[PDB]
Symmetry: C4
Subunit: 331 residues, 4 copies
């Protein structure tokens, strides 16, 4: 594989159509899904030349841990849909690559089993029916060694997935929510923040004042995101809000972004717009479907090579230097 | 049906081509018809997160009545062209859905029969040869229980419908103007305003100063509209004038918009740009052609679900909150 | 024919390919040819409503004469290429329609014969080898009753017509320059201005300061034009310079525009951007090729109907009102 | 050949696919490769009329020598890949056309042999493992009569050429680096500047402050360039940075540009944006592949004719006048 696009083909070949559609699809007309890519393709980097590249490093420190790349694996529910080893395969490859892995509330392997793999696990929280059971998942995650709580805030309910509706898609009986819902509010965030010493990261922020409020609320990070175009159809891409959000929080929390990151060059664009790190979702599942743990390993090695390549070609010996790059929007 | 686009296909299958063309077409090169859709697709919403959604309501109060959605059925002439029950089928479904229905001057069932269905009927006025007969239609409408007069102001004459001209389209003899024309001016508006206690709504306003003058003239509302691209070919889409018009009237009248609204997400966009409500035209006729009253019921249920979905995903418990959303224009 | 596009098809059918290419083509990659259309399609009009349309008139006064439309037939060389009656057919139809006709220096019928048709003939000048012979053409034109000299200023030499080069196109022996070249300068303009009492109109102005200088030089008009994309490939469309040019000359001369005008709606756009009038080139030749004098008559009747339609739908009882319309650029 | 596009076809026919791909391709997704063309196509020139064109000249003085056009042949490695005479064929044609030829560090004929052809040779430097051997190439070039050192600064390493990777492309054994690498820094530039009296030209500058620093560092010129989209995928096109760079250096060095120049009109655009001259890469190799030295001669004659044509049509008797043209960005 010489690009991430190589893996999507392989995944399309092996996966049942309705499962590929569950993975690929978005809500409504998929306007926001498409816009995530459009928006990245309009960004051009202004590279710097003639700088010292003797020790280029793609490493970052985030939420108290070194990561090998400014990247984590996005939360993706029910990974056994894509390969029999599901979350274990992905978590093992992420660990070996030095990349944080986000364990889902709706994981198809229990969070404790996935955490036992080691590495840098984060835990993604969906708010439950009750504060006490929500906080129990959080406590489980913390007890198991997860190092951040990624509280997803853009799913008061699931968006309208028309591919799933037309396919009559349902979870096969051989996939379960192995850790076993209500709309979250700012009160829910405070309940979580008070219940853990772990950094709380709010995933799904797009409005500048919600980013500001996240910092005021004690969040250690946010993910600027429209949930891969799966939630509000017509939601602005995170990448188009990122610069304004980074300016507004002025270093008060980590600012991650996701949606359509498909190469090391895309990681560089995100960094140049001010992101601390990116999440990558669908491509990690393509790699998992295509070739299991080894597939995910190959994807992460490819991404690592592309990130180093893009950084050096842009004159950046560190991710902090890449954040100081300027950009120019094209057509 | 999981989207409005499902219904257009069914309508295309059942309707005679020249009738489908009468419905689908625009004037001239159909530049304004296409631009209505382009313009909506360029609008992205910036959703808010973590707000209280315990009692999301899509209801609005407009022209003295509660409506179930920020939506009314647009005036569409000669609905028996599309189904034998014509206006009665549509009016019944609108009533049952809690949506206002606009009875046309050129209705193929008399305005009194359609009003007898109940619900929230509005009446759309085309200015006639003479002030006295124009005012008679208005008086008929008011006597029959219509609750607003939608005075169409962008048809001094009918636009050049090239599909109709190439098809040699004419009303079949089995369709008549069951209520049975000159250019309207501001004097005509005043004649109507003086003749009724009902709110007068000027449909087809695009210039900011015409919106201002509408308020000065005593209009209770305007519809920002290029008549679905059927009148001036090259007229700006209403959605591209809406924000500027809403700012200029500064609460002095209701500001509705139409043209290309095809989903609950589109309703949300219109609301976020400042609209009080939208009108929906062609899709209601697709539903009527495809499946009569039941078809229109299904369309309105779908739209209601999509509007509630979009509002909640955008953090809006009410339509007023949706009007306070920000937007960002894309490419 | 219900549109100008109807006629192009007919012309394509009847004309030898190399002659159709001579007519349709532009210079270089035809970037400017295409951009003339792109640019018009991006312009949207903001129509006014509810104005008095009791006596809508499309007439204008220009260069001392009433014209039936804000339009003239552009200079097009060698019209016998397209029909045996050539310039006589076009001039007769223009006369009957009340539209000025521009007689070319490179006409295939002598300027005196074409002037004898009557109507409102203008004369287009290409600067010759010598001042004295140039001025002789001007004097011939004036003696024959031409009412303006349209001095073409964007052809120091003919552009690179790659269609013509690939076709090995040459004038057939049955077409001649019946009135029988060096780069023109501002000195040439002054020589012409001093030699005639007729208004001198500079055709091919695109730079704002060249428009200003044209007024200073005593021009009665300019045509803002990139010569239909036939001269500099990459020249900005006239329609994209028009508003800035109209503002800069501030009523000091008539400002016409051409390039891609293909409907009455396009005439309205040009007027709303500030043009006094438009020229129309290729469509008049399509009509000539398709059906001779009668074809040109039909085209001009169609354009007249479309101009009246567009004006009234936009709330304009006169061309001066249409010049006060606002516009909004789309995508 | 009536355009540069004629030659690409011929080259595609004759060259082995993997060699055509080596020539045509870019890095990554080829976003920057495509953007070079997009960016040029969006630029429109505002031509001037009625100026004296009695002695139009396309000549410029640059780096102490007259050149026949504001153009040089870009450095392209390993030209024997495209024709058996390789660099000798191209250098001979460039000499005969009065165009500088850039001899590459990775030339497939020795720099001394190519310099012996005569003409105006420049020498392109890739920084080597060691300062002393780097400076030896520079000294060789100067001894052999090269008149500028074009130090390529955007290749700390070669970009990711996915076409080459998928083709498994490697140099055939019949092509060698006949003159026989580490990342260059500003220290390397100073080492070169101190080692030669020749002007040093930094090729691959895109950031405005790198252009400023180039002048401060004693560079005689820069080439604003993204290396033909072959280095950082997502790097902004040089043509989109050119105007800002020209303003920032304020005459302190020559500012060249390359990337996608494919006609005399493109040369005019570059000049109007402020370039001193352009480089042309791939088209020169198309001509070489198609027809050897004679092919390159034909290409340069065509470009010369197109440049003269574009300049005169734009009212420019000199390249300095063309630099004073205004432009307008289109869609
Ligand atoms: C199949 C699938 C399942 C997902 N499940 C979750 C989830 O359980 N929790 C969550 O916060 N995001 C979930 N996401 C959203 C991703 O974390 C991410 O925001 C999105 O995929 C955008 O990134 P991408 O374009 O790289 O896929 C899911 C996305 C996909 C495609
Ligand atoms: C077939 C058809 C008939 C219409 N008849 C009327 C009419 O009688 N009066 C009126 O004011 N608008 C009329 N309209 C315009 C609509 O009210 C509305 O402005 C337009 O269709 C744009 O909305 P849409 O894109 O949702 O169809 C008609 C539209 C269509 C398509
Ligand atoms: C076949 C042809 C011949 C033309 N001959 C002349 C000419 O002799 N003199 C002139 O000033 N313009 C000439 N023009 C330019 C036109 O007057 C006009 O500027 C151009 O066609 C743009 O208008 P259009 O898009 O309506 O064709 C010619 C154009 C065409 C297509
Ligand atoms: C096959 C090929 C080889 C090249 N080799 C070199 C090189 O050795 N040194 C260099 O500075 N640029 C090299 N370049 C870049 C060119 O000098 C130039 O920047 C680029 O091709 C953009 O111009 P174009 O679009 O006219 O090809 C090469 C380009 C190509 C296509
Ligand atoms: O985007 C997703 O699929 C998840 O975030 C979800 F939580 F919304 C979800 C999980 C499982 C099935 C449908 C939606
Ligand atoms: O857009 C429409 O079709 C109506 O608004 C109309 F009034 F213009 C009309 C009604 C019937 C036939 C043609 C136009
Ligand atoms: O655009 C044109 O064809 C004319 O304006 C011309 F004068 F340039 C010309 C006339 C006849 C043949 C080629 C060009
Ligand atoms: O763009 C290029 O091909 C050259 O500039 C290069 F130096 F990068 C190079 C030369 C030979 C093989 C691969 C890259």
């Amino acid at each position: 594989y010489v690009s991430l696009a190589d893996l999507e083909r392989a995944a399309r070949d092996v996966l049942p159509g309705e499962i590929f559609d569950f993975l690929a699809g978005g809500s409504g007309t998929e306007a926001s899904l498409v816009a995530n890519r459009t928006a990245l393709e309009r960004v051009f980097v202004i590279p710097r030349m003639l700088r010292d590249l003797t020790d280029v490093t793609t490493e970052i420190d985030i939420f108290g841990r070194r990561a090998a790349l400014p990247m984590a694996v996005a939360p993706v529910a029910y990974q056994r849909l894509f390969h029999p080893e599901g979350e274990l395969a992905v978590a093992r490859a992420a660990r070996d690559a030095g990349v944080p892995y986000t364990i889902c509330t709706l994981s198809s392997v229990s969070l404790e089993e996935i955490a036992a793999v080691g590495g840098r696990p984060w835990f993604q929280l969906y708010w439950l029916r009750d504060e006490k059971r929500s906080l129990d998942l959080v406590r489980r995650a913390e007890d198991a060694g997860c190092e951040a709580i990624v509280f997803t805030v853009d799913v008061p309910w699931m968006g309208r997935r028309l591919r799933d509706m037309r396919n009559g898609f349902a979870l096969p009986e051989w996939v379960t929510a192995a850790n076993f819902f209500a709309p979250a509010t700012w009160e829910s965030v405070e309940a979580v923040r008070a219940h853990t010493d772990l950094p709380v990261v709010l995933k799904g922020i797009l409005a500048v004042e919600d980013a500001r409020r996240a910092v005021d609320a004690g969040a250690g990070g946010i993910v600027v995101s429209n949930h891969g175009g799966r939630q509000l159809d017509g939601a602005v891409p995170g990448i188009e809000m990122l610069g304004e959000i980074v300016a507004a929080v002025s270093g008060g929390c980590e600012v991650l972004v996701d949606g359509g990151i498909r190469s090391g060059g895309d990681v560089l664009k995100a960094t140049a717009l001010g992101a601390s790190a990116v999440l990558v979702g669908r491509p990690v599942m393509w790699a998992l479907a295509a070739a299991g743990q080894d597939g995910v390993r190959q994807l992460l090695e490819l991404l690592a090579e592309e990130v180093r390549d893009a950084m050096g070609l842009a004159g950046c010996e560190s991710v902090g230097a890449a954040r100081r790059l300027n950009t120019k929007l094209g057509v």
